[PDB]
Design a protein around this nucleic acid. Structure first.
Length: 135
RNA sequence: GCCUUCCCUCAACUCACGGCAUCCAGGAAUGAAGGAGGGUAGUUCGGGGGAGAACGUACUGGUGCGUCAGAGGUGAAA
């Protein structure tokens, strides 16, 4: 088929970048290269209304269309990299994390070697805000 | 306790005895304050100060390699 035919009957390790924020959730597909990709999924496609595009439901509904497209790319095993937010944002992911993982596991994809890959500064620029804060 | 004898006074000059040759005023000042100043030493002690050279990720932008439809953002939106 389109996917494995020289890696077939053997697990293949993709990589999945998960970026969870409070405006959307992203689920991306990479192959231990990051130079080539197959699919880019956003919460906002599956669920409409901007509040609910970062909600748990968004994640899970999106996650099932990861699995759908992975089994056509020969990908079976998935390494995962969880990302929070920017280095001048916070250090907290949105609610779309922890939802996506479970949705993939339950959908028969293997998961191993999860990691925390996020941009944390040694130090960076003045954080957005003010001296007196947002109020 | 003391005298004498005996061992018999070491740091390259040290100890004992003698010649006589020299040079030539000099030691008579209160003390050293849990008062001040200074010296020396531990390659002491420290986000102390100046200079010069590298290092770290992030933010932002650009470039290249891929993907494809929404993304920013909010209480909700725009």
């Amino acid at each position: 088929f389109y996917g494995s035919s020289a890696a077939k009957d053997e697990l293949v390790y993709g990589v999945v970048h998960i970026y969870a924020s409070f405006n959307d959730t992203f689920v991306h597909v990479t192959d231990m290269s990051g130079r080539e990709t197959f699919c880019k999924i956003t919460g906002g496609m599956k669920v409409k209304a901007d509040r609910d595009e970062s909600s748990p439901y968004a994640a899970m509904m999106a996650a099932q269309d990861v699995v759908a497209r992975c089994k056509e790319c020969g990908i079976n095993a998935l390494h995962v990299k969880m990302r929070a937010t920017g280095g001048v944002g916070t250090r907290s992911p949105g609610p779309g994390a922890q939802a996506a993982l479970r949705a993939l596991a339950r959908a028969g994809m293997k998961i191993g070697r999860i990691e925390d890959v996020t941009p944390i500064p040694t130090d960076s620029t003045r954080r957005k805000g003010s001296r007196r804060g947002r109020r």
